């Protein structure tokens, strides 16, 4: 008479690593590194904005691509690869910093500068580079000031915007750089051009400069965009001789949101907290090997294809 003690085993064991063994066979194991992600931006439960071909900078100055995206509210803001900021070709000072501020925002409210110009100024300069509805147009949030009478000196002008609101305002402007002495004379006169800008927390001077350049969107002339934050109760003033691209409106960035850059289409029936440019990651696992660039609440990225965690005893077959 006999009674025997034993443990189960399986025909197919799983190999796992241990402190003392590279190749240790156990009854069962599971993955701890996620390798699969969702090819959509899972947006259910998020007030989200897909910018499409609107670049975040474009929202502020109102490039035609961005007409659907000039005001709004969102907790998630999606930026896309084909994104357009500029129709009249140009560049922006500290552009990445500005883009990051926008991409962190919870929305944008627009507010008139209230700027008015006298009879000497034509403030409706438009161009073929900025088509709006089959017709020549310009940045929606800016006005291209030029001499009403061609070749005449642009008048000495002062414009002041007061932030009478209780939160900070972001205001942008441009400095026109003509592409020929002839073009510059027609627009602003033969006089020396000076544009000077100032608040309690900004002072700068700009001088339009003529120069031959390659055509971008058909234009050899450029616009240099600048920006600063105007604090509550402060006033900002522009003194200009010609060449200022004045703000018709200023921006208020509201609250907070999560900025995402991605290739993936949105799925609004899908819920997620982790994003990468391929889409979303939904997993209970602590690690992942999909991408080292992720946004939101995510498992940590690791340089391993697989990490097997044993869920059973040593497997010893018959």
């Amino acid at each position: 008479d006999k009674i025997c003690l034993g443990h189960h085993a399986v025909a197919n064991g799983t190999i796992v690593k241990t402190l003392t063994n590279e190749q240790e066979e156990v009854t069962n194991a599971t993955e701890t590194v996620e390798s699969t992600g969702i090819n959509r931006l899972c947006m259910k439960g998020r007030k989200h904005k897909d910018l499409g071909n609107c670049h975040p900078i474009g929202m502020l100055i109102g490039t035609p691509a961005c007409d659907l995206h000039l005001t709004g509210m969102w907790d998630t803001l999606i930026e896309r690869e084909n994104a357009i900021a500029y129709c009249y070709p140009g560049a922006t000072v500290n552009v990445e910093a500005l883009r990051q501020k926008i991409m962190e925002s919870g929305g944008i409210n627009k507010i008139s500068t209230g700027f008015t110009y006298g009879s000497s100024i034509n403030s409706a300069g438009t161009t073929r580079a900025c088509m709006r509805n089959g017709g020549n147009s310009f940045y929606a949030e800016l006005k291209w000031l030029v001499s009403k009478s061609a070749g005449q000196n642009f008048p000495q002008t002062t414009n002041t915007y007061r932030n009478t609101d209780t939160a900070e305002h972001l205001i942008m402007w441009g400095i026109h750089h003509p592409s020929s002495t002839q073009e510059k004379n027609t627009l602003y006169g033969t006089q020396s051009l000076s544009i000077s800008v100032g608040s309690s927390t900004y002072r700068n001077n700009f001088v339009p400069v003529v120069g031959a350049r390659p055509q971008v969107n058909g234009l050899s002339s450029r616009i240099d965009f600048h920006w600063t934050l105007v604090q509550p109760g402060d006033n900002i003033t522009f003194s200009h001789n010609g060449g200022l691209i004045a703000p018709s409106r200023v921006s208020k960035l509201i609250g907070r949101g999560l900025g995402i850059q991605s290739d993936a289409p949105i799925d609004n029936n899908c819920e997620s907290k982790c994003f990468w440019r391929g889409g979303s990651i939904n997993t209970r696992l602590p690690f992942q090997n999909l991408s080292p660039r992720t946004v939101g609440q995510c498992p940590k990225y690791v340089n391993r294809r697989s990490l097997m965690l044993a869920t059973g005893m040593r497997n010893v077959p018959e």
């Binding site: 900025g259 869920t311 005893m313």
Partner: protein, 171 residues
Amino acid sequence: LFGAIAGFLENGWEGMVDGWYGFRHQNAQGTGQAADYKSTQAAIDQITGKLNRLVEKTNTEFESIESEFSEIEHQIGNVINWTKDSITDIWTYQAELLVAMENQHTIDMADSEMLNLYERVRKQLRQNAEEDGKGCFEIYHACDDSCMESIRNNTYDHSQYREEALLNRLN
């Protein structure tokens, strides 16, 4: 390491799908097999606790510091590449260590639950049985099917069979 699961027990039993740990008995009226519920649940409950710990991570919200679609200033970019790579090296290392350490413990835990079942049976048998080197107990009295069940059941009374058992051992 405890002496059992890859040790004095020769191998596992592919035949026992009933549980992780079990009994096999041979007695006058044929042979039989039954899994011990307490011990397997002891091991399994511990495994699920490890798994709970692994997925129970609530999380910090990170924002982007690298532009996917536009270029970044070169020096800040290089600082960012260096930092992110340093963080990844740490996480890869921690992930490798957690799983190696955790697997070593899991194995030695399951081996422990096995030894404990074996010891529990041994004390229960007292002087009525002896150990062969493998996991078997050679029992020195006639042990009934109901009697075998009494050993698994933890109900078996050694005193009841002791005289017969002691006599058989000595003679």
